[PDB]
Amino acid sequence: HRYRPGTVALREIRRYQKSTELLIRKLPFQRLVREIAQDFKTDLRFQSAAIGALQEASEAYLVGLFEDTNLCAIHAKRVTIMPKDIQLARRIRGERA
Amino acid sequence: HRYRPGTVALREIRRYQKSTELLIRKLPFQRLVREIAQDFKTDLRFQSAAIGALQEASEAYLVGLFEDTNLCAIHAKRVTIMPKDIQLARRIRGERA
Amino acid sequence: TRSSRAGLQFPVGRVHRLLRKGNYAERVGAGAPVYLAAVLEYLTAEILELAGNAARDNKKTRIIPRHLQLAIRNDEELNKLLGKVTIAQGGVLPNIQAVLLPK
Amino acid sequence: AKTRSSRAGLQFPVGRVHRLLRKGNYAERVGAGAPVYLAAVLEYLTAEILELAGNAARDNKKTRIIPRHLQLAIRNDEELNKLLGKVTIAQGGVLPNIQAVLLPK
Amino acid sequence: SRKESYSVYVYKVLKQVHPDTGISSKAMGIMNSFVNDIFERIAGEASRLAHYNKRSTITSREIQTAVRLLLPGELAKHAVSEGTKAVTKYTSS
Amino acid sequence: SRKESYSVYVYKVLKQVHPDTGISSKAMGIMNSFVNDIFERIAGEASRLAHYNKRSTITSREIQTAVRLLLPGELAKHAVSEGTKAVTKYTSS
Amino acid sequence: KVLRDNIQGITKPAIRRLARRGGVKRISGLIYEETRGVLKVFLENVIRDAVTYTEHAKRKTVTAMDVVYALKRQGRTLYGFGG
Amino acid sequence: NIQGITKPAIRRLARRGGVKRISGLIYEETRGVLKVFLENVIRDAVTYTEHAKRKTVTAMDVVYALKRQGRTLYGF
DNA sequence: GGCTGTGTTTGTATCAAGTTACCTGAATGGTAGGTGGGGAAGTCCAAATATTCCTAGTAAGACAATTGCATTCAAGGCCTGGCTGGTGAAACCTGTTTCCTGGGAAGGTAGTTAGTTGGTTTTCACCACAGGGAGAACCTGG
DNA sequence: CCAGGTTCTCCCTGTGGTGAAAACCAACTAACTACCTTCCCAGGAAACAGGTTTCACCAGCCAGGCCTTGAATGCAATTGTCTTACTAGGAATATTTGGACTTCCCCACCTACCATTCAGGTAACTTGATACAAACACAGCC
Ligand SMILES: [Mn+2]
């Protein structure tokens, strides 16, 4: 059979709030970090724990951003986030001018 | 003859963005600050310039808060502001009382 | 021994050295580092108290950073002290907004 | 050249800055050209701000500079606003700015 | 070389407050960085308090005012009480 | 007593950049607090940079790295250029 | 002398003019009281800090530099009063 | 490259934040902001590593750069 | 088209810079000196690069059902202005309280040596929790 | 209410992370000494609260009214959900190579000190940018 849409989403919300593992795959993130790092200075090497620290910081930053985005979306009587919500949250925090 | 709703607000917006005097009367603000100062410690004296500095800072804080509240209210397809907007803006700022 | 003489646990001589070798003033008077060590002892005692309670409520006996995260983010005053703090392997509280849940 | 600013061709007092760096307990000791470099940095920043301040001042037909012009020159630029986004200028005011949907038709 | 930490003292405090609660290495590293963070905050604030009044000595009074500034209400009250008890216990000995 | 300020130097810089622009006292006080603020930021950051590498001397390199950290891009580039010119002009004399 | 009933010293046209400077057109009637509450919270987290400096140097008079240091600690730097 | 941030992966992050239903155009948005968040950190961290005249970014450089941002990280 | 506000010069008077003579104290200058910092070589630790493989996550394609969105209308809740009285504000005299300066005494605190005791390090047993698989049961669509 | 599907719990096996213990060694305390910021005491005076007056500008109140908000609704359409192929990351492992780190050794260089000096805070005299008042042109608004 089939589930109604939204039920297993709440199941997934409980599932991912319950556990505390990493969620972004490691090697694409590492290639992204090295690819950005090429432009500021060439010939750079990384301790792996530094790449882990960057992954932790990026994950926590995006999680807080999605929570505040969800609050903005619930304010306007909708249940689906939109890019103007992300822009609103980043404006009110004062990240982008 | 009577003005229409819409024009007088724009005139006041242009005036009070043009000029930079203060907007809160000095004596009730002074009574309020001296009241709250008495609430912590008895028998405290103020230089007048410190009271002026407090008035400048609190005016700046309230003006910035209303700007962010206006952005939040314009986001929700409305023109009137409501206290839900202030509460949401103070949550997104992070200063949650 | 200064820590026994004050009846404390944090090493007074180490904190006294670290106030010397940190360039904070000209001279450090005594009575300061014992006061500081007592403050740190009280804070660590508070956090380990709440962490042990949260660990016992999940049928475990060692402490993982999930326990520390749930211990900090439940108490109000430690949450206001540590709002700018990211803990590794931490996670969040189980939090559900109201209008999400169906009928 | 008697003074050290004359030896470097600057305007800020290098001896004063060196005195502050020694008696602000920022280190155990201070190198030679460090207050020179720092005085240069301060002079460039001060000139960069006062130039745009004077331009915004003469854009309203006034001769002196009052803090409203400093407010308008800081906020109308971009780099200074990224630098000074946590500062309230006394007697400041805001930019003349109205949102788009508020204007009637 | 030989790096300095606080883990043995954390063990002593833990066994004073709980008999049978273990602790992993990760939690120990977090608590070590936590202690270093709070000590850095309080030492910096005490330094600025000593510098503001043109004084050149850190005493217990500056740390008492710094702890009263940084920590919120109930924690500040209990911390001032604990530190006062510790100072009296050291001084009477 | 006798308080220390920077107003005469602000006059000199203003007359180098503009012949006929006056300035009130309030703007002078704002610029004085501004100079003290930036000097405090740079000195604190240079102190932490000297402390991080177990070094015990502030040189020009630490201030160059601090100015490269605090200021944004174009201002940092122009400031490093100005300071380098000033160091060379002082050293050759 | 006891002191009470001063939070209504901030009046409706004052908050009206403040919202007019921010660029707000239409205001509900329920903003006003609410705004007062926010202001009160703000003053606590200045004055509670400020007098502590005044309590540290053993004084009875809160100067201007103490307010400037309190605001500098809160994360809102103020210029134009020294410091 | 930048497409290594995978389309179902991002969903998981939004499911940790408690978001129930997501649009599509968030995806092309989300690769932007994250990229900007790296462009402030690494630019600082490299500036530490050139200061010590070394050629390898260690963990304490990332920790110091995050501390200057205000996003303080423990554990390391 | 009539009512209105913002802007364009004219002129004062005035209070707020600007200019100039003077008294201090912070800056400058040559010389020990020791000390912090640059260079040089090993070595050992530690990131980079090939390989394979196999598995678990990912890409894509259809399909409904649920949510976003434009419309429409009622009502209400907030803009507007006229007028009364009501309190802020400016000025001036008065007491008196706290701050700053100044001198003298002092207890506290760096500074050196000597003796020793607690703080690290390696290896060693073993128990709390991973894994799983099975049962049970609560949960959600039909 | 009924069928099935994911989730909670129980029990067995295994383990490697963790508490424990013996040996190593640099930090901690005690005792004595110089000396030095800091505590205490008294006064001059600047400033702060207090009060009063007279005015002058603005806050409250109440009625009119009309435009914003909000609930109900139909309709389009974008997104969750399920299934199938496929493809690239995780992990071990070996190779290798450049690089941080540490042991020693040599050289610039900042600090301290003291005699010399000039430029810079301070006060009195002088001019002038501008708020203010007031009349008139333009722009625009309904
Ligand atoms: Mn009271």
Numbering used by the authors:
A (entry chain E), B (entry chain A): 39 to 135
C (entry chain C): 16 to 118
D (entry chain G): 14 to 118
E (entry chain D), F (entry chain H): 29 to 121
G (entry chain B): 20 to 102
H (entry chain F): 25 to 100
Give the published text:
Integration of the reverse-transcribed retroviral genome into a host-cell chromosome is catalysed by integrase (IN), an essential viral enzyme (reviewed in1). To carry out its function, a multimer of IN assembles on viral DNA (vDNA) ends forming a highly stable nucleoprotein complex, known as the intasome. The nucleoprotein complex from the prototype foamy virus (PFV) contains only a tetramer of IN, making this well-characterised intasome an ideal model to study the basic mechanisms involved in retroviral integration. Herein, we employ a combination of cryo-EM and single-molecule Förster resonance energy transfer (FRET) assay to understand what impact retroviral integration has on the structure of the target NCP.
To this end, we decided to directly compare the cryo-EM structure of the intasome-NCP strand-transfer complex with that of an isolated NCP, containing the same native human D02 nucleosomal DNA sequence. Firstly, the NCP containing D02 DNA is less stable than NCPs wrapped with strongly positioning sequences such as Widom 60115,29. However, exposure to mild crosslinking conditions (0.05% glutaraldehyde, 5 min, 4 °C) yielded tractable particles that were visible on open-hole cryo grids. To facilitate asymmetric particle alignment, we introduced a biotin moiety on the end of the DNA arm distal from the integration site and decorated NCPs with streptavidin. Next, we used single-particle reconstruction to determine the 4.2-Å resolution structure of NCP-D02-streptavidin complex. As the streptavidin is linked to the 5′ end of a distal DNA arm, it is less ordered than the rest of the assembly, and appears not to be engaged in interactions with the NCP core. Detailed inspection of the isolated D02 NCP cryo-EM maps provides insight into intasome selectivity. Firstly, nucleosomal DNA arms appear to be flexible (as detected by inspection of the local resolution map reported in Supplementary Fig. 3, and given the significant number of unwrapped NCPs averaged during analysis). Another notable feature of the D02 NCP is the limited interaction between DNA and the N-terminal tail of H2A, reflected by poorly defined density contacting nucleosomal DNA at SHL 4.5. We speculate that a loose DNA engagement renders the histone H2A tail available for intasome binding as observed in our strand-transfer complex, hence improving substrate selection.
